[PDB]
Design a protein around this ligand. Structure first.
Ligand SMILES: [Cl-]
Ligand SMILES: [Zn+2]
Length: 103
């Protein structure tokens, strides 16, 4: 019994100039113990480094990400943790451009 497997590809919705909703599913493989939290990371389009997109892990399967730069393009990925620790990150979401909707 070890850490969870990867979550699936997240969905991004409700995009504004500086916020978005990111949602995902529970990993199929929990490693043998209950999932206690999820890390959400973000990467600006064609940049290399993944960075924390939320201050601390969430337990629900979605979150409102804030602090995104207007005019930038981002993708997001999720990692799950249990008592044994964090599992590998899942694949990146589709990219979204941060802009206030017209209307
Ligand atoms: Cl699920
Ligand atoms: Zn953690």
């Amino acid at each position: 019994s070890g850490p969870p497997g990867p979550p699936e590809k997240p969905e991004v919705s409700n995009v504004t100039k500086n916020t978005a909703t990111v949602s995902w599913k529970r990993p199929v493989d929990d490693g043998g113990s209950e999932i206690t939290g999820y890390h959400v990371e973000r990467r600006e389009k064609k940049s290399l480094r993944w960075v924390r997109a939320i201050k601390t892990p969430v337990s629900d399967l979605r979150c409102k990400v804030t602090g995104l730069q207007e005019g930038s393009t981002y993708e997001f990925r999720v990692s799950a943790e249990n008592r044994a620790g964090i599992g590998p990150p899942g694949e990146a979401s589709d990219s979204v451009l941060m802009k206030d909707a017209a209307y």
